[PDB]
Protein backbone atom coordinates (compact mmCIF):
# COMPACT_ATOMS: atom_id res chain seq x y z
CA UNK A 1 0.00 0.00 0.00
CA UNK A 2 3.19 1.85 0.37
CA UNK A 3 3.37 2.51 -3.74
CA UNK A 4 -0.15 3.44 -4.24
CA UNK A 5 -0.54 6.84 -5.97
CA UNK A 6 -2.90 10.04 -6.00
CA UNK A 7 -4.45 11.25 -8.91
CA UNK A 8 -3.83 14.91 -9.49
CA UNK A 9 -5.94 17.97 -9.40
CA UNK A 10 -7.64 20.09 -12.06
CA UNK A 11 -5.90 23.22 -12.49
CA UNK A 12 -7.11 26.34 -14.15
CA UNK A 13 -4.94 26.99 -16.93
CA UNK A 14 -6.58 29.71 -18.91
CA UNK A 15 -10.02 31.17 -19.36
CA UNK A 16 -12.78 32.44 -22.14
CA UNK A 17 -12.84 35.76 -22.06
CA UNK A 18 -16.42 37.65 -22.61
CA UNK A 19 -15.55 40.75 -21.64
CA UNK A 20 -15.76 43.01 -24.82
CA UNK A 21 -17.12 42.75 -27.73
CA UNK A 22 -15.13 39.68 -29.02
CA UNK A 23 -14.77 36.50 -27.52
CA UNK A 24 -11.12 34.93 -27.11
CA UNK A 25 -9.51 32.53 -25.37
CA UNK A 26 -6.58 33.66 -23.19
CA UNK A 27 -3.93 31.06 -21.55
CA UNK A 28 -2.70 31.64 -18.14
CA UNK A 29 -0.91 28.63 -17.37
CA UNK A 30 1.50 26.47 -19.56
CA UNK A 31 2.04 22.38 -19.41
CA UNK A 32 4.99 22.56 -16.79
CA UNK A 33 3.26 24.98 -14.32
CA UNK A 34 -0.12 22.56 -15.19
CA UNK A 35 1.63 19.48 -14.37
CA UNK A 36 3.52 20.29 -10.89
CA UNK A 37 0.06 22.10 -9.89
CA UNK A 38 -1.57 19.15 -10.58
CA UNK A 39 0.70 16.97 -8.53
CA UNK A 40 0.39 19.64 -5.61
CA UNK A 41 -3.25 21.12 -5.79
CA UNK A 42 -1.63 25.34 -5.06
CA UNK A 43 -2.60 27.35 -7.37
CA UNK A 44 -1.83 30.86 -6.60
CA UNK A 45 -2.54 32.49 -9.83
CA UNK A 46 -5.04 35.16 -10.14
CA UNK A 47 -8.61 33.74 -11.63
CA UNK A 48 -11.27 36.15 -13.37
CA UNK A 49 -14.38 35.43 -15.84
CA UNK A 50 -17.22 33.25 -15.66
CA UNK A 51 -15.37 30.19 -18.18
CA UNK A 52 -12.12 28.48 -17.16
CA UNK A 53 -10.35 26.09 -19.57
CA UNK A 54 -9.31 23.40 -17.21
CA UNK A 55 -7.01 20.76 -17.42
CA UNK A 56 -5.71 17.20 -15.79
CA UNK A 57 -3.12 15.30 -16.73
CA UNK A 58 -4.60 13.56 -19.46
CA UNK A 59 -7.36 15.93 -20.69
CA UNK A 60 -8.63 19.41 -21.17
CA UNK A 61 -11.91 20.50 -21.33
CA UNK A 62 -13.77 23.79 -19.93
CA UNK A 63 -15.63 24.60 -16.19
CA UNK A 64 -18.35 27.37 -16.07
CA UNK A 65 -19.55 29.71 -12.66
CA UNK A 66 -22.96 29.71 -12.02
CA UNK A 67 -24.50 30.58 -8.66
CA UNK A 68 -21.36 30.66 -6.68
CA UNK A 69 -20.53 27.04 -8.29
CA UNK A 70 -17.51 25.98 -10.57
CA UNK A 71 -19.07 23.74 -12.84
CA UNK A 72 -17.64 21.16 -14.65
CA UNK A 73 -18.82 17.33 -16.35
CA UNK A 74 -17.67 14.10 -14.13
CA UNK A 75 -16.61 12.49 -17.68
CA UNK A 76 -13.64 15.36 -17.36
CA UNK A 77 -12.94 16.10 -13.83
CA UNK A 78 -14.24 12.23 -12.20
CA UNK A 79 -13.93 12.87 -8.84
CA UNK A 80 -10.78 14.88 -8.76
CA UNK A 81 -10.06 18.25 -6.46
CA UNK A 82 -9.34 21.39 -7.99
CA UNK A 83 -5.83 23.23 -7.56
CA UNK A 84 -6.56 26.50 -4.96
CA UNK A 85 -3.69 28.94 -3.56
CA UNK A 86 -4.50 26.85 0.01
CA UNK A 87 -4.49 23.43 -1.56
CA UNK A 88 -6.57 20.41 -3.13
CA UNK A 89 -10.24 21.65 -3.09
CA UNK A 90 -12.64 18.83 -2.72
CA UNK A 91 -16.10 19.05 -4.97
CA UNK A 92 -19.00 20.00 -3.40
CA UNK A 93 -21.24 18.72 -5.99
CA UNK A 94 -20.52 15.18 -7.54
CA UNK A 95 -23.34 13.18 -9.81
CA UNK A 96 -22.40 10.69 -12.14
CA UNK A 97 -25.78 9.89 -13.27
CA UNK A 98 -25.73 13.87 -14.53
CA UNK A 99 -22.42 13.72 -15.62
CA UNK A 100 -21.75 17.04 -13.76
CA UNK A 101 -19.30 17.91 -10.66
CA UNK A 102 -18.83 21.22 -8.79
CA UNK A 103 -16.89 23.08 -6.72
CA UNK A 104 -16.86 26.35 -4.79
CA UNK A 105 -15.85 29.10 -7.32
CA UNK A 106 -12.60 30.71 -7.47
CA UNK A 107 -12.07 33.51 -5.64
CA UNK A 108 -12.43 36.58 -8.28
CA UNK A 109 -14.14 34.55 -11.02
CA UNK A 110 -17.78 35.96 -12.05
CA UNK A 111 -20.94 33.87 -12.27
CA UNK A 112 -23.28 33.79 -14.46
CA UNK A 113 -27.10 34.43 -13.68
CA UNK A 114 -29.27 31.58 -14.15
CA UNK A 115 -31.64 32.11 -17.06
CA UNK A 116 -35.60 32.42 -16.61
CA UNK A 117 -35.89 33.90 -19.85
CA UNK A 118 -37.91 30.63 -21.52
CA UNK A 119 -35.65 31.33 -24.71
CA UNK A 120 -34.85 28.95 -27.20
CA UNK A 121 -32.70 30.76 -28.94
CA UNK A 122 -28.87 29.54 -27.09
CA UNK A 123 -25.70 30.13 -28.12
CA UNK A 124 -22.30 27.91 -27.23
CA UNK A 125 -19.23 28.84 -25.81
CA UNK A 126 -16.61 26.74 -26.80
CA UNK A 127 -13.20 25.96 -25.66
CA UNK A 128 -11.65 27.94 -28.65
CA UNK A 129 -14.05 31.04 -28.08
CA UNK A 130 -16.41 29.88 -30.45
CA UNK A 131 -19.91 31.32 -30.27
CA UNK A 132 -21.92 28.92 -31.92
CA UNK A 133 -25.66 29.59 -32.05
CA UNK A 134 -27.85 26.79 -30.73
CA UNK A 135 -31.83 25.76 -31.42
CA UNK A 136 -33.31 24.66 -28.16
CA UNK A 137 -34.89 21.60 -29.07
CA UNK A 138 -35.76 19.85 -25.44
CA UNK A 139 -35.09 20.09 -22.04
CA UNK A 140 -31.31 18.66 -22.40
CA UNK A 141 -30.96 19.30 -26.25
CA UNK A 142 -30.39 21.93 -28.65
CA UNK A 143 -29.39 21.86 -32.77
CA UNK A 144 -26.37 23.61 -34.19
CA UNK A 145 -27.68 26.11 -36.82
CA UNK A 146 -24.29 25.41 -38.53
CA UNK A 147 -23.50 21.50 -38.05
CA UNK A 148 -20.00 20.91 -38.22
CA UNK A 149 -17.24 18.21 -38.03
CA UNK A 150 -17.63 16.85 -33.54
CA UNK A 151 -13.29 17.85 -33.89
CA UNK A 152 -14.41 21.40 -33.39
CA UNK A 153 -16.47 20.83 -30.51
CA UNK A 154 -14.35 18.31 -28.84
CA UNK A 155 -12.66 19.67 -25.28
CA UNK A 156 -15.53 21.85 -24.86
CA UNK A 157 -17.70 20.09 -22.22
CA UNK A 158 -17.97 21.90 -19.61
CA UNK A 159 -18.97 25.33 -21.24
CA UNK A 160 -22.00 27.18 -20.88
CA UNK A 161 -24.85 27.36 -23.23
CA UNK A 162 -26.15 31.28 -22.96
CA UNK A 163 -29.19 33.12 -24.03
CA UNK A 164 -29.74 36.10 -25.88
CA UNK A 165 -28.81 37.94 -22.27
CA UNK A 166 -26.16 36.04 -21.63
CA UNK A 167 -28.30 33.86 -18.88
CA UNK A 168 -26.67 30.31 -18.34
CA UNK A 169 -29.20 27.94 -19.59
CA UNK A 170 -26.76 24.91 -19.33
CA UNK A 171 -23.33 23.13 -19.25
CA UNK A 172 -22.66 21.02 -22.41
CA UNK A 173 -22.15 17.64 -21.84
CA UNK A 174 -21.94 15.47 -25.17
CA UNK A 175 -22.49 16.10 -28.89
CA UNK A 176 -25.08 14.10 -31.29
CA UNK A 177 -23.36 13.35 -35.09
CA UNK A 178 -23.73 11.60 -37.82
CA UNK A 179 -20.77 10.12 -39.62
CA UNK A 180 -18.50 12.92 -37.58
CA UNK A 181 -20.49 15.55 -37.87
CA UNK A 182 -21.99 17.71 -35.14
CA UNK A 183 -25.96 18.12 -35.58
CA UNK A 184 -26.87 18.53 -31.67
CA UNK A 185 -26.10 19.13 -28.75
CA UNK A 186 -26.73 17.53 -25.41
CA UNK A 187 -26.51 19.80 -21.93
CA UNK A 188 -27.07 19.92 -17.94
CA UNK A 189 -29.86 22.31 -17.69
CA UNK A 190 -29.52 25.00 -15.33
CA UNK A 191 -32.41 23.91 -13.44
CA UNK A 192 -31.33 20.73 -13.16
CA UNK A 193 -28.13 22.33 -11.75
CA UNK A 194 -30.43 24.37 -9.62
CA UNK A 195 -31.89 21.41 -8.16
CA UNK A 196 -28.53 19.88 -6.95
CA UNK A 197 -27.69 22.50 -5.22
C1 LIG B 1 -16.81 8.17 -16.81
O1 LIG B 1 -17.98 8.52 -16.10
C2 LIG B 1 -18.98 9.07 -16.92
C3 LIG B 1 -20.32 9.48 -16.32
C4 LIG B 1 -21.42 10.09 -17.19
C5 LIG B 1 -21.15 10.30 -18.70
N1 LIG B 1 -22.17 10.89 -19.57
C6 LIG B 1 -21.91 11.07 -20.97
C7 LIG B 1 -22.98 11.68 -21.89
C8 LIG B 1 -20.56 10.64 -21.53
O2 LIG B 1 -20.30 10.82 -22.89
C9 LIG B 1 -18.88 10.70 -23.21
C10 LIG B 1 -18.12 11.77 -23.02
C11 LIG B 1 -18.82 12.85 -24.08
C12 LIG B 1 -17.99 13.87 -24.80
O3 LIG B 1 -17.15 13.58 -25.60
N2 LIG B 1 -18.34 15.26 -24.51
C13 LIG B 1 -17.86 16.46 -25.19
C14 LIG B 1 -16.41 16.83 -24.94
O4 LIG B 1 -15.88 17.74 -25.46
N3 LIG B 1 -15.70 16.04 -23.97
S1 LIG B 1 -14.09 16.49 -23.70
O5 LIG B 1 -13.94 17.87 -23.22
O6 LIG B 1 -13.32 16.38 -24.93
C15 LIG B 1 -13.40 15.27 -22.53
C16 LIG B 1 -13.49 13.77 -22.87
C17 LIG B 1 -12.14 15.71 -21.77
C18 LIG B 1 -13.50 15.68 -21.06
C19 LIG B 1 -18.66 17.58 -25.84
C20 LIG B 1 -18.09 16.46 -26.72
C21 LIG B 1 -17.28 16.83 -28.00
C22 LIG B 1 -17.14 16.01 -29.06
C23 LIG B 1 -17.77 14.61 -29.14
C24 LIG B 1 -16.63 13.61 -29.43
C25 LIG B 1 -17.22 12.21 -29.77
C26 LIG B 1 -17.94 11.68 -28.51
C27 LIG B 1 -19.48 11.76 -28.76
C28 LIG B 1 -20.26 11.43 -27.49
N4 LIG B 1 -21.65 11.50 -27.82
C29 LIG B 1 -22.66 10.92 -26.94
O7 LIG B 1 -22.37 10.20 -26.03
O8 LIG B 1 -23.98 11.24 -27.29
C30 LIG B 1 -25.03 10.75 -26.48
C31 LIG B 1 -25.17 9.41 -26.65
C32 LIG B 1 -24.79 11.08 -24.82
C33 LIG B 1 -24.94 9.91 -24.14
C34 LIG B 1 -24.86 8.72 -25.22
C35 LIG B 1 -26.27 11.48 -26.93
F1 LIG B 1 -27.37 11.04 -26.21
F2 LIG B 1 -26.00 12.81 -26.72
F3 LIG B 1 -26.37 11.24 -28.28
C36 LIG B 1 -19.92 12.46 -26.40
O9 LIG B 1 -20.14 13.62 -26.54
N5 LIG B 1 -19.28 12.03 -25.13
C37 LIG B 1 -18.88 10.50 -24.81
N6 LIG B 1 -19.54 10.08 -20.69
C38 LIG B 1 -19.82 9.88 -19.28
C39 LIG B 1 -18.71 9.27 -18.40
ZN1 LIG C 1 -32.13 34.29 -20.05
Known amino acids: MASMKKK ?3 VIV ?14 TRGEEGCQETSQTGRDKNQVEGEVQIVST ?20 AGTRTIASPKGPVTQMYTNVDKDLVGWQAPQGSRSLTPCTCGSSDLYLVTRHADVIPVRRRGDSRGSLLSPRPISYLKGSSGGPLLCPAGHAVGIFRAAVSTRGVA ?11 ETTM
Open 8 to 10: GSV
Open 14 to 27: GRINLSGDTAYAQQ
Open 57 to 76: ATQTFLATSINGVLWTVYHG
Open 183 to 193: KAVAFIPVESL
